[PDB]
From a paper:
In this context, Orc1 is of particular interest as it contains a bromo-adjacent homology (BAH) domain, a nucleosome interacting module, at its N-terminus. For proper function, Orc1 as part of the ORC complex must bind at two dramatically different types of chromatin: closed and inaccessible regions within heterochromatin as well as open and accessible regions within euchromatin. We also show that this newly discovered role of Orc1-nucleosome interactions is distinct and independent from its known roles in silencing and replication. Together this study suggests a mechanism that allows Orc1 to bind nucleosomes across the genome irrespective of the acetylation status of histone H4 and reveals a process where direct interactions between Orc1 BAH domain and nucleosomes are critical.
As this residue is conserved between Orc1 and Sir3 (Top), we expressed the Orc1 BAH L79I mutant in insect cells for our studies. We report the crystal structure of the complex of the Orc1 BAH L79I mutant in complex with the nucleosome core particle determined at 3.3 Å resolution. The structure shows the BAH domain bound at each of the two opposite faces of the nucleosome, creating a pseudo-two-fold symmetry (Bottom), similar to that seen with the Sir3-nucleosome complex. The Orc1 BAH domain interacts with the H4 tail, the LRS (Loss of rDNA Silencing) domain composed of histones H3 and H4, with the region of H2B adjacent to the LRS surface as well as the H2A/H2B acidic patch. The acetylated N-terminus is visible in each of the ordered BAH domains and displays a large conformational change when compared with the unacetylated apo-Orc1 structure. The acetyl group projects into a hydrophobic pocket formed between strand B6 and the loop connecting strand B8 and helix A5, stabilizing the conformation of Loop 3. Particularly, the side chain of I79 makes VdW interactions with a hydrophobic cavity formed by side chains of H4 T71 as well as H2B T96. This residue, L79 in the wild-type protein, was mutated to isoleucine to increase the affinity of Orc1 to nucleosome. The most striking feature of the Orc1-nucleosome structure is the absence of an ordered H4K16 side chain in the electron density map of all copies of Orc1 in the asymmetric unit.
Residue numbers in the entry:
A (entry chain K): 2 to 23, 28 to 96, 128 to 213
B (entry chain B): 18 to 101
C (entry chain G): 12 to 118
D (entry chain H), F (entry chain D): 32 to 124
E (entry chain A): 38 to 134
G (entry chain C): 15 to 118
H (entry chain F): 18 to 100
I (entry chain E): 40 to 134
The structure:
DNA sequence: ATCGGATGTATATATCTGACACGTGCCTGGAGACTAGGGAGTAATCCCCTTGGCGGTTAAAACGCGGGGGAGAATCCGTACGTGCGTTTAAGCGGTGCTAGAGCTGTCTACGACCAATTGAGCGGCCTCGGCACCGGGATTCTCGAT
DNA sequence: TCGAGAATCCCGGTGCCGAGGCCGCTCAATTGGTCGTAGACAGCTCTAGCACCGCTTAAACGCACGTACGGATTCTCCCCCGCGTTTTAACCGCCAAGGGGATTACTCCCTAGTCTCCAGGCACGTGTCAGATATATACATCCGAT
């Protein structure tokens, strides 16, 4: 969000490590995590969560993975940093591809929250598939659309949730060379 | 989809650090020196570029100009001439 | 009557009116006396003349008729007081002085 | 639009010191940066001087004290001289 | 087969790169490095040519000065070979670490 | 005459973070000097920010950018946060 | 009802506004700058005083002397980076002896 | 006529310099260190006191106050708190 | 009698846990007045002025001694030498 | 002089080696002095002057050592080493170093010379509204060769250098002191004359 | 290694004392209620300069190998520095006494801000030529292995 | 310390693009006033900086003795330099698209300004309690004897 009137439907929730927090004094060795809750139905977006956004620049829609949550930058009250996915037409139409290319998302383009699984979970759950909600991610490649390296997407979710962004980004960069 | 930039710190080649040291009057260079120099240069550039992008963002611009680098350097006590 | 620039009354080349304007509107004080711009412009002109003299000597030593930044770096770093004034200052395209330690020399 | 500089003044002083000697654009921009840096330094020191003494005006005395604070050694002396002369001429006209 | 002793070509390179002012790092790798460092602050940034040129000027200046101090630190240990310990000491006295 | 300081406010803050803790007069003067030093640093940086962009006003935006330039690490985070809270209350009352 | 009371702070928003207006920093000063600036100063004072109170209780003293301030500042990384070129009087130094100089 | 203050740099005694070095984490001290330190301190005080006296004279005063010393120290990048 | 070095380390710990000034007040005040005599004649000093001067000088010298001790250890030594101080002041930029 | 009109009866003249000036840029040392225009009286470095000390009530002789120019309070400062009058010396120190307090005062006031001054390593800034005339300083031999024609207001002699307290006399050639003041910079000359008596 | 003596230190408790925390009068600075002139928000448009691409050259980078020599380890000697102990010195203190000068005040004047008319100084654009870059050819100055 | 080989240096020739001079042409510097107040300045108050005296005793100085540390010295291993060969991607010239940097114009929001009103915070004063100081008592540590 740029202004304060651009996130009226949302709310910023702060957590110590896993429990809820609502405080000021910089505590020693306690890094605070942030996420944002849409009050319309209490939808929570934090690090690791993959979302679907309306990409009006391409005419289609794009899928991202929230990596970092900058609060109160010197231009945007909230900056949503996310890794980009490569859709099917940039290389099964519900198989995505992770990239280290980052992007800044604005909340007014949010649609739903993508359910990303691997190959085993994709074969296990074939009869109950939703085209606009469930996706599978097996590889990670470059933004150009080549050099595919298979990786468990659940482990990547956990690692983005755990380690700091400035380290995981460089980690994902050197995974394809 | 812009071109992915990775491992560009390796672009500071060994002969480049060698030339920089030769200008500094260094006769013999240890092997581990080059990696240390790459790290130190990365730290320096990170600080300067973070301050310059702060200046550019304050001006509500998307193009980092030379005056931003000059202001960041002068803020860090590294006043630079020849660019304004 | 007829106009007369303050730079002519002071006998200087640097602009006294421009220095006065930069001092009054530069957020330095509430007001600026009429003697501050003259004094400041004179000091600036003197320091410019010092730099330019040493750099012109450095340019003539290379038998070149135009001052390049390398000449400025030579002029600044070979003068003790000018190098002390421009300590934390980097002159782009200036290079370094020809200096090698004693121990690094061949024996 | 117009953006001013000290190019013509530096060129005048150069022709004074070295009549048939030129200067490149990079060195010209370096000279302009130097003039602006010295200006900022002296004017800031004089500003803090006047603010210390509960004074509201920047007189040439503040510029002189700032010069003696900043410029080292003989550079100060001559500079003060070159300042005083100018003042004594301007105050005479 | 004519062959110079170890150290002669080193001193010749010192003299060769001390009498000139050209940038000693390759330009395009440095520009790509600057862009890779800046992409972590704001996405899809643009740079004036003068911006990356001033960055490279300041970077090479800082590295040359640090190398002078590091060579002084190596000589202080009665050595002629700069070592990471010398760089660490130099940046410790300067206050950079 | 009266020469003011930041004593009573630092005392309130100390009693808020540590209710049963006093402070010596020398440490009091140290805290006052620290407050004034940080103030002049942030104000100078905001002034430079406004002057670079050809603006004539020190808005809260310049203060926030100056804080992000001067305060390092997590201090820069929390401080910004605190700066945003006060403003939010001030525009409400 | 002072502006410091309206913004929920302890530092004087009015005095900070006066100092910004008459400190020769800019022609005009917005009414939101003193609030933000005082809030930041309050956070910094709070951080230093809480770390100093911790160090003072660890020294079994209920009054904060400059030594507690120096300990709190030099033991905190970001505070020490904030006061790098700054000298705290009557603060001494942190106890640190190089590992080379330990007896054998 | 006050008694001539002469070679008061020698008043920085050897035990005092030794204490200063002990605070700085020094275990063994050479002989030339003492005169070297006297010279270093003399240059330091020369610069700082020259600036402080410039501040005092600019205020048209004859007494060097604490504010002059604090302003000189700040001007030399050695900001001092407490005064 | 202790080995040479034990009393020195005890001095280190004592003077690191304390914050008192390590130089006598009156000789330092005389030094300040002698130095100022070459700048202006018949100057006066508040007690706080000379005290701030002494605090600044002691901080400067102790920090310089820490850097000098590092300069001595870098050369595989445990004794500070004048070349260590000179190198430290050179790296700092005071030279 | 504080302001310009405080030197209105004087004029500042600078010479580099021998020739005069009416420079700007530095060069690879200039000397300054001031001339009273009513009679062309030149005061430079090493010159001895007599000043009206309105604190003691009598007068006091000084030796110009430095000529600070364009300070932040005075346009011209006149730094000078001080002399010691015959009544500003210690009789006990002279009676113990060379060989009841009133008796030594008697011995000194009766036996000493009224015009014998002594140098000091202490200096005092002088102002031109207390200047009378230029003093002529002799040595040990010239004072005895010139005994008949001695102007009591223009002729003095100095043999010893001592501290301002008036003890620990040390003799030195005063003409050599006049030469040494003009030869070397004041920072070193004052130090040398200071450590001559410790 | 293990154990006793000696040394200085961490530690427990108690005792002054002067520095700190709070009470009080008050006055000068901050708030409330308006107004106004301009700075800043915001949209529209010109156009500059940033991004990107492609092909060919080749100069720099990368790799590898012989080997000189430099870093590092281990040794030996002299001496410079640490550690106590007794003697010498003056720092520190705790008062008095004074007076130079910091500090506050009450004018009153000269000097600087502010605004309107005028222009020529300093700006941006336009050639254009010569100082300098580029390249080659021959001379000079080293370097290094040995008669 | 004498020649063969190899870097650099200096000079002649050719071409180029950037430094310089000049042309209008906006606009800011000048001129010419008026008016407001900042500070120059003499005077009074009175703060505190200078000077001093003697006493105590902690600090500094000098000296004896010994040891451990710095510095010189020899030897050795491997690592970094010189140089040759192969590979690569920097670099230059030329071209095209358009993103976003400036500039302009209109509007209106905001902050300086003032006048009045009052209370927040400071100078002053006072009592009293946490820390500097002290004495003594375990206790860790050092260091040599065994």
């Amino acid at each position: 969000a740029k202004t304060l009137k651009d996130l009226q439907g949302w709310e910023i929730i702060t957590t110590d490590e896993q429990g809820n927090i609502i405080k000021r004094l910089r505590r020693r060795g306690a890094k605070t995590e942030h996420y944002l809750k849409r009050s319309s139905d209490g939808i929570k977006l934090g690090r690791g969560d993959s979302v679907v956004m309306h990409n009006e620049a391409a005419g289609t829609y794009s899928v991202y993975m929230i990596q970092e949550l900058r609060l109160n930058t010197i231009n945007n009250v909230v900056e949503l940093w996310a890794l980009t996915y490569l859709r099917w037409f940039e290389v099964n139409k519900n198989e995505l591809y992770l990239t280290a290319e980052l992007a800044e998302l604005q909340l007014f383009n949010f649609i739903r929250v993508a359910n990303v699984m691997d190959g085993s979970k994709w074969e296990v759950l074939k009869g109950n598939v939703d085209p606009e909600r469930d996706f599978t991610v097996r590889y990670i490649c470059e933004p150009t659309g080549e050099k595919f390296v298979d990786i468990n997407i659940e482990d990547v979710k956990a690692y983005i949730k755990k380690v700091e962004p400035r380290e995981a980004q460089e980690y994902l960069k050197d995974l394809t060379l | 989809h812009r071109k992915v930039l990775r491992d560009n710190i390796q672009g500071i080649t060994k002969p480049a650090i060698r030339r920089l040291a030769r200008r500094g009057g260094v006769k013999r260079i240890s092997g581990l020196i080059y990696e240390e120099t790459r790290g130190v240069l990365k730290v320096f550039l990170e600080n300067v570029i973070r301050d310059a992008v702060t200046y550019t963002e304050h001006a509500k611009r998307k193009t980092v100009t030379a005056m931003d680098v000059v202001y960041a350097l002068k803020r860090q006590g590294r006043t630079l001439y020849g660019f304004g | 009557a007829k106009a007369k620039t303050r730079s002519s009354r002071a006998g200087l080349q640097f602009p006294v009116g421009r220095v006065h304007r930069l001092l009054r509107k530069g957020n330095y004080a509430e007001r600026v006396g009429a003697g501050a711009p003259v004094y400041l412009a004179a000091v600036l002109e003197y320091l410019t003349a010092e730099i330019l003299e040493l750099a012109g000597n450095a340019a003539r030593d290379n038998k070149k008729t135009r001052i390049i930044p390398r000449h400025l770096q030579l002029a600044v770093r070979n003068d003790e007081e000018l190098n002390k004034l421009l300590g934390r200052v980097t002159i782009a395209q200036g290079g370094v002085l020809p200096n090698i330690q004693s121990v690094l020399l061949p024996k | 639009t117009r953006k001013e500089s000290y190019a013509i003044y530096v060129y005048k002083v150069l022709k004074q010191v070295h009549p048939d000697t030129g200067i490149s654009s990079k060195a010209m921009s370096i000279m302009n940066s130097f003039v602006n840096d010295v200006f900022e330094r002296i004017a800031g020191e004089a500003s803090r001087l006047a603010h210390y003494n509960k004074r509201s005006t920047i007189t040439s005395r503040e510029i002189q004290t700032a010069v003696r604070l900043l410029l080292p050694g003989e550079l100060a002396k001559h500079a003060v001289s070159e300042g005083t002369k100018a003042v004594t001429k301007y105050t005479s006209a | 087969p004519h062959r110079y002793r170890p150290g002669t070509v080193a001193l010749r390179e010192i003299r060769r790169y001390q009498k000139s002012t050209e940038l000693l790092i390759r330009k395009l790798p440095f520009q790509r490095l600057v862009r890779e460092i800046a992409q972590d602050f704001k996405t899809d940034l643009r740079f004036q040519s003068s911006a990356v040129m001033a960055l490279q000027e300041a970077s090479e200046a800082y590295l040359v000065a640090l190398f002078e101090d590091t060579n002084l630190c190596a000589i202080h240990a009665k050595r002629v070979t700069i070592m990471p310990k010398d760089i660490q000491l130099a940046r410790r006295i300067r206050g950079e670490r």
